[PDB]
Design an enzyme around this catalytic site. Sequence first.
Site, mmCIF file in Angstrom:
data_model
loop_
_atom_site.group_PDB
_atom_site.id
_atom_site.type_symbol
_atom_site.label_atom_id
_atom_site.label_comp_id
_atom_site.label_asym_id
_atom_site.label_seq_id
_atom_site.Cartn_x
_atom_site.Cartn_y
_atom_site.Cartn_z
ATOM 1 N N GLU A 1 -4.488 14.279 -51.678
ATOM 2 C CA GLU A 1 -3.771 13.210 -52.354
ATOM 3 C C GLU A 1 -3.437 12.048 -51.413
ATOM 4 O O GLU A 1 -3.686 10.883 -51.741
ATOM 5 C CB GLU A 1 -2.479 13.738 -52.990
ATOM 6 C CG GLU A 1 -2.650 14.576 -54.241
ATOM 7 C CD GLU A 1 -3.331 13.850 -55.402
ATOM 8 O OE1 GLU A 1 -3.421 12.603 -55.392
ATOM 9 O OE2 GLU A 1 -3.776 14.540 -56.346
ATOM 10 N N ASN B 1 -3.153 1.986 -60.019
ATOM 11 C CA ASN B 1 -4.157 2.304 -61.017
ATOM 12 C C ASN B 1 -4.220 1.073 -61.922
ATOM 13 O O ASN B 1 -3.369 0.871 -62.786
ATOM 14 C CB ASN B 1 -3.740 3.561 -61.792
ATOM 15 C CG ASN B 1 -3.468 4.769 -60.867
ATOM 16 O OD1 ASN B 1 -4.377 5.290 -60.216
ATOM 17 N ND2 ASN B 1 -2.214 5.211 -60.815
ATOM 18 N N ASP C 1 -4.399 1.441 -66.006
ATOM 19 C CA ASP C 1 -3.211 1.675 -66.820
ATOM 20 C C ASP C 1 -1.919 1.067 -66.275
ATOM 21 O O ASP C 1 -0.851 1.284 -66.839
ATOM 22 C CB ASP C 1 -3.036 3.168 -67.179
ATOM 23 C CG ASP C 1 -2.574 4.025 -66.012
ATOM 24 O OD1 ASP C 1 -2.483 3.534 -64.879
ATOM 25 O OD2 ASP C 1 -2.286 5.216 -66.244
ATOM 26 N N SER D 1 -0.154 1.759 -63.531
ATOM 27 C CA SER D 1 0.818 2.662 -62.939
ATOM 28 C C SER D 1 0.425 2.806 -61.474
ATOM 29 O O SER D 1 -0.671 2.412 -61.079
ATOM 30 C CB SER D 1 0.863 4.021 -63.660
ATOM 31 O OG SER D 1 -0.342 4.747 -63.504
ATOM 32 N N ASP E 1 0.685 5.524 -57.949
ATOM 33 C CA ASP E 1 0.968 6.850 -57.418
ATOM 34 C C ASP E 1 1.695 6.639 -56.064
ATOM 35 O O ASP E 1 1.238 5.850 -55.237
ATOM 36 C CB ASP E 1 -0.340 7.640 -57.252
ATOM 37 C CG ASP E 1 -1.031 7.901 -58.575
ATOM 38 O OD1 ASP E 1 -0.325 8.221 -59.543
ATOM 39 O OD2 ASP E 1 -2.270 7.777 -58.664
ATOM 40 N N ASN F 1 3.099 9.916 -60.043
ATOM 41 C CA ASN F 1 2.908 8.741 -60.919
ATOM 42 C C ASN F 1 4.189 8.097 -61.475
ATOM 43 O O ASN F 1 5.078 8.787 -61.999
ATOM 44 C CB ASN F 1 1.947 9.116 -62.065
ATOM 45 C CG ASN F 1 1.402 7.893 -62.831
ATOM 46 O OD1 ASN F 1 1.931 7.508 -63.872
ATOM 47 N ND2 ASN F 1 0.300 7.338 -62.352
#
Length: 130
Positions: free
Chosen positions: A35, A46, A49, A51, A53, A60
């Site tokens: 990750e 992202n 969408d 959003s 991380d 998220n």
Amino acid sequence: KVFERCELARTLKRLGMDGYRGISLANWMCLAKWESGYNTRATNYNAGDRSTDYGIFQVNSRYWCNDGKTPGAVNAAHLSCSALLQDNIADAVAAAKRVVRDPQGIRAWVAWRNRCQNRDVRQYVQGCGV
């Protein structure tokens, strides 16, 4: 902060992650590695969408932390996403525990399915003293 492998292993053990909701320490290590590469300031936007991380576990902003700029967001863990960018991972750990309390468990992270699930993950905690 970029953690050293064993340093992180011992730190997650002390925070009570080993076997949390059936998830072994080796699995949490495999997750952090893919990750963020054990980096607490890792962030990923992202564009599709809107959003982002955040942190060592790439949590998220739509469901687990609030950053104010994520459309249709919720704060399940009820944290500021800022808290997941500290060198001290206590809050990132609390958020990660919250994520896996949902039925999906560790599967919530697609990276876990791609690179950890059904594999030999002993390598992530080998020689660390945990």
